[PDB]
Design a binder for this molecule. Structure first.
Ligand code: NA
Length: 207
């Protein structure tokens, strides 16, 4: 599948793409405002994620730090990033279908639209000012709005026992972005698309 990753934000982001134990395509790239990066993701990929990183510094070997979304200090991410990160999530060619969603389970840093560029299903978006409205206890100094599991490490927020309900903190993310997952057991906002669809991820879609 092809994913076009577009930075419509007025600031530079460092896109990242991983399936947790490996990079997708090159795994990461700087996107200045307006830039687009096209990657190719192997069919059948399960559990892929794309996210933005902010305020990064890399040396000539691709090593450094980012204030949000850092993936072990690498420009080309092999691993998932440190919260807070708005996440585009996807599993491709799963019994004939692709499954996409946006998640706030690991917090929010940059607004996002995740839409097919081929026929057959709708896109999803989380474009509210979550960072501006973020509850005080969830604000991340580097930027961004952490999820409650990251901040408080309780069984209820992290849904460790497989039972857990919505919380004051999950409801905040859900109020502002009802089409994104707000906690692990949220009612699914996954979209089913035809297998082998192509997609566009746009950071700051309403910019
Ligand atoms: Na998230």
């Amino acid at each position: 599948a092809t994913f076009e990753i577009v930075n419509r934000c007025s600031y530079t982001v460092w896109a990242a793409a991983s399936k947790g134990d490996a990079a997708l395509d090159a795994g990461g790239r700087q996107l200045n405002s307006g830039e687009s990066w096209t990657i190719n993701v192997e069919p059948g990929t399960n559990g892929g994620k794309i996210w933005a990183r902010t305020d990064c510094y890399f040396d000539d070997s691709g090593s450094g730090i980012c204030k949000t979304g850092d993936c072990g200090g690498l420009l080309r991410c092999k691993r998932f990033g440190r919260p807070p990160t708005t996440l585009a999530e996807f599993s491709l060619n799963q019994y004939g279908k692709d499954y996409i969603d946006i998640s706030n389970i690991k917090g929010f840093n940059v607004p996002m639209n995740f839409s097919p560029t081929t026929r057959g299903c709708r896109g999803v978006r989380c474009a509210a000012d979550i960072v501006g409205q973020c509850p005080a206890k969830l604000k991340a100094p580097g930027g961004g709005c952490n999820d409650a599991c990251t901040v408080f490490q309780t069984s209820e927020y992290c849904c460790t026992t497989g039972k857990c309900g919505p919380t004051e903190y999950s409801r905040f993310f859900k109020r502002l972005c009802p089409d994104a997952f707000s906690y692990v057991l949220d009612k699914p906002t996954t979209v089913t698309c035809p297998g082998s669809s192509n997609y566009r991820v746009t950071f700051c879609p309403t910019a």
